[PDB]
Motif scaffolding. Structure first.
Motif: not given
Ligand SMILES: COC(=O)[C@H]1[C@@H](OC(=O)c2ccccc2)C[C@@H]2CC[C@H]1N2C
Lengths: 216, 219
Positions: B38, B40, B44-46, B48-49, B95, B111, B173
């Motif tokens: 996955x 991001x 912050x858009x996720x 699924x790969x 991730x 992580x 940041x």
């Protein structure tokens, strides 16, 4: 494929209050086996997403029983009972009925706490940076609430807008405050042309700005 | 116990391939899950790969077109992401995760590993001490800091007194400009403890194999 939509939370939640967070699917997530394949995750500031709920209403192992999920086949709700400071973060839903297994774009939970004025500190350029020919003046505005804040730089009493870069932390998971850094960057030679440098913070906790300054 | 750990380069040039490794710990990768990647994006858009299952069976997000391959090396308890022909739009935190038939990942998300896709050159930070101009209201608190300037790519890790100073720290940041990042970190300590007791920021930039300590000395 499936588009998942999440509702924004318009308002911050005080610790001890409960809050519902909702998401919607363009297609039913209720499957032929009677189960509804909808996950909820929490992504705390700086961390990986953590599963809270799967199959719409089943808590993941180890998850606080303050979290519960419900819904129909297209509208879903995560209820967070007795919100704690540490619950701050972004909540995401994900469908698990159709490939690819899409996520919603998240709902951010903000915690409401007592107003707090920023602790403001100003720092001159270091001698190390000056030898390289650079001069950054840094102001920290730390541990304030609510998040809305204005910083103004003044050099010898005149407002300075160029060369300023700001950064804001996420809301703190322990005390629910925010912090901000503002850096004014000049060349060494520009820096040496002026004497007094001022960072002025304006925040709802006072009508008069908090002013920190130094003289070169 | 059962956990997943990503590794791989933090920076890849456009048009090259991005490769990441997920190491499964505690547990054999031959257990029957969908071993998943996955990502991001900034903002912050996720996404699924894809997954691999049963060692050799995969499926991918059509968004990735023909660019993705996931493979597995059972002998190392690892699975791998290869994403070809990258562009700056592939900059993301990647991730790995383990999914089961019901959508349950348990605690099994890695992580995360930042990958920046850019032609910009790896550059270590300059670390400058931030010490207060003169004296001020003592018998209370003093704020110190560290300015971490001019590095690429993200991330850096900042600690204070090698991690012994953890409370009262704010690491901000980074801000990007001209293909270099800058970030600062503040620490607030009792005026009784500094300068009588030393305060040092430790700044690691794994991407350039650099770690710097900067002791904060009074002006
Ligand atoms: C697209 O496949 C699915 O969504 C199925 C299932 O997913 C899979 O079969 C699957 C196979 C390989 C990898 C990941 C998921 C999830 C739940 C249970 C059945 C059905 N879904 C409602």
């Amino acid at each position: 494929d499936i588009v998942i939509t999440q509702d924004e939370l318009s308002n911050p939640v005080t610790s001890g209050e409960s809050v519902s967070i909702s998401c919607r699917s363009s297609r039913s997530l209720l499957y032929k086996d009677g189960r509804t394949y909808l996950n909820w995750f929490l992504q705390r500031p700086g961390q990986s997403p953590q599963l809270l709920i799967y199959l719409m209403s089943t808590r993941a192992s180890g998850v606080s029983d303050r979290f519960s999920g419900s819904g129909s086949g297209t509208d879903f709700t995560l209820e967070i009972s007795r919100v704690k400071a540490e619950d701050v973060g972004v909540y995401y839903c994900q469908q698990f009925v159709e490939y690819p297994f899409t996520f919603g774009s998240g709902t951010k939970l903000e915690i409401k706490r007592a107003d707090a004025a920023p602790t403001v500190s100003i720092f001159p350029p270091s001698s190390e940076q000056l030898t390289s020919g650079g001069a950054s003046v840094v102001c920290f505005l730390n541990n304030f609430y609510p998040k809305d804040i204005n910083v103004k730089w003044k050099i010898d009493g005149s407002e300075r807008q160029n060369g300023v870069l700001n950064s804001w932390t996420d809301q703190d998971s322990k005390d629910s405050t925010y912090s901000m850094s503002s850096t004014l960057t000049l060349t060494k030679d520009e820096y040496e042309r002026h004497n007094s440098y001022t960072c002025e913070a304006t925040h709802k906790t006072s009508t008069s700005p908090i002013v920190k300054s130094f003289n070169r | 116990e059962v956990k997943l750990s990503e590794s791989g380069p933090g920076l890849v040039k456009p048009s090259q391939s991005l490769s990441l490794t997920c190491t499964v710990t505690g547990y054999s990768i031959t257990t029957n899950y969908a071993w998943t990647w996955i990502r991001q994006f900034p903002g912050n858009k996720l996404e699924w790969m894809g997954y691999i299952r049963s060692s050799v069976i995969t499926r991918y997000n059509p968004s990735l077109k023909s660019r993705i391959s996931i493979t597995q090396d059972t002998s190392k308890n690892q699975f791998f992401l290869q994403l070809n022909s990258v562009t700056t739009e592939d900059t993301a935190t990647y991730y790995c995760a383990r999914y089961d038939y019901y959508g349950n990942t348990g605690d099994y998300w890695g992580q995360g590993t930042s990958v920046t896709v850019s032609s910009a050159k790896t550059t270590p930070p300059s670390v400058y001490p931030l010490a207060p101009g003169t004296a001020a209201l003592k018998s209370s608190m003093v704020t110190l800091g560290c300015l971490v300037k001019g590095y690429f790519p993200e991330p850096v890790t900042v600690t204070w007194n090698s991690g012994s100073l953890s409370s009262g720290v704010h690491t901000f940041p980074a801000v990007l400009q001209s293909d270099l990042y800058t970030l600062t970190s503040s620490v607030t300590v009792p005026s009784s403890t500094w300068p009588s007791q030393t305060v040092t920021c430790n700044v690691a930039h794994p991407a350039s194999s650099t770690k710097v300590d900067k002791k904060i000395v009074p002006r």
